[PDB]
Swiss-Prot record:
Phosphorylated by pachytene checkpoint kinase IME2, but also phosphorylated in an IME2-independent manner. Phosphorylation probably eliminates SUM1-mediated repression and is also required for full transcriptional activation activity. Phosphorylation of the DNA-binding domain by IME2 does not alter DNA binding affinity. GO terms for biological process: cell division; meiotic cell cycle; positive regulation of transcription by RNA polymerase II; sporulation. Changing R281A: Reduces DNA-binding by 50% and abolishes sporulation. Changing P25A: Reduces DNA-binding by 65%. It comes from Saccharomyces cerevisiae (strain ATCC 204508 / S288c) (Baker's yeast). This is Meiosis-specific transcription factor NDT80. Transcription factor required for successful completion of meiosis and spore formation. Gets activated after completion of meiotic recombination at the end of prophase I. Recognizes and binds to the middle sporulation element (MSE) 5'-C[AG]CAAA[AT]-3' in the promoter region of stage-specific genes that are required for progression through meiosis and sporulation. Competes for binding to MSE with the transcriptional repressor SUM1, which represses middle sporulation-specific genes during mitosis and early sporulation. Binds to DNA as a monomer. The keyword Metal-binding does not apply. The record marks R26, R79, R139, R170, R216, R281 as: Interaction with DNA. GO terms for molecular function: DNA-binding transcription factor activity; sequence-specific DNA binding. Coiled coil: none annotated. The keyword ATP-binding does not apply. Induction: Induced during prophase I of meiosis. Requires protein kinase IME2 for initial expression and continued transcription during meiotic divisions. Can autoactivate its own synthesis.
DNA sequence: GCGACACAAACAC
DNA sequence: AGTGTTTGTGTCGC
């Protein structure tokens, strides 16, 4: 009924089938590590502006809620939240140096203003994009929004336990204890240590996330989870690392820039999950029917 | 099959 | 130790 795997940090992931077993909404058993991500590809090379040294990049993603490993499939529920978190790392460049440097895209060089992550859902069989929606903790009593592009600086990915503990914190003292894990406050650095052209100072806002945290995410409510044959559709969640540049023939999305003009989110790397099954609202997807 | 509303159970404090 | 919060899912009604 419950299959348990030991996580990297010593917590457990407890996989169970909601067709057979109903667990409380807030039980820690709803938190678990989801499917591992795999490289789709690398795109545009990035180089440090004087040395010309290639910046090596790696997305570090994990799902921390919403997916169970049930007999060789990864299974989510349309009605329920998932959590997807990601950082990235630069194996050849320590953070302190990285933030003081400046970087170009090797397409012919476009200056990187900042690095950012976006997420996407796709039909894994035909590459069609599927809309995602997020809620706040207030859910129907608050706004719905689509996942946004998240400016980020390189950081280790927090342990599963940490994501779990920070999920619904309000108290100011607890927030202070997690602040350094999730944010860099540019306004608190010594400005005199930085050149005008430094990467840190072309980020759009003073509060810069170290971790992209997409919580309370769902597939759009209109998504069809079965094919006409009644076979399950296969979905996949994608994490894309990009460099945002000022465009004033490679893969990119347009981005609503800070000053208001047309910006470019140039793809650097993309990872994705293996195929995912999503269970819809049918009564037979729930243990109540039995 | 979807939007809305309701109930309930463990969490956060 | 009690109050209000968060989120899985039961249900209505179109």
């Amino acid at each position: 009924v419950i299959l348990t795997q030991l996580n990297e940090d010593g917590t457990t992931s407890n996989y169970f089938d909601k067709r057979k077993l109903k667990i409380a909404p807030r039980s820690t058993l709803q938190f678990k590590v989801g499917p591992p991500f795999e490289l789709v590809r690398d795109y545009c090379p990035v180089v440090e502006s004087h040395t010309g040294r290639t910046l090596d990049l790696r997305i570090i993603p994990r799902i921390d809620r919403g997916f169970d490993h049930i007999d060789e499939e990864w299974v989510g529920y349309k009605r329920n939240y998932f959590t997807l978190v990601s950082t990235f790392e630069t194996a050849n460049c320590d953070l302190d140096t990285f933030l003081k440097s400046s970087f170009d895209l090797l397409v012919g060089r476009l200056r990187v203003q900042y690095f950012a992550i976006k997420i996407k859902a796709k039909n894994d069989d035909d590459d069609t994009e599927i809309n995602l929606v997020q809620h706040t903790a207030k859910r129907d009593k608050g706004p719905q929004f689509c996942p946004s592009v998240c400016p980020l600086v390189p950081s280790p990915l927090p342990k599963h336990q940490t994501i779990r503990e920070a999920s619904n914190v309000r108290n100011i003292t607890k927030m202070k204890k997690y602040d350094s894990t999730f944010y860099l406050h540019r306004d608190h650095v010594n400005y005199e240590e930085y050149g005008v052209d430094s990467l840190l100072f072309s980020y759009p806002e003073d509060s810069i996330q170290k971790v992209a945290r997409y919580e309370r995410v769902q597939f759009a409510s209109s998504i069809s989870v079965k094919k006409p044959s009644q076979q399950n559709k296969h979905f996949s969640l994608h994490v894309i690392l990009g460099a945002v540049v000022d465009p004033d023939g490679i893969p990119y999305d347009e981005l609503a820039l800070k000053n208001g003009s047309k910006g470019m989110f140039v793809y650097l790397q993309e990872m994705k999950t293996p195929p995912l099954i999503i269970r819809g609202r049918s009564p037979s997807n729930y243990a109540s029917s039995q």
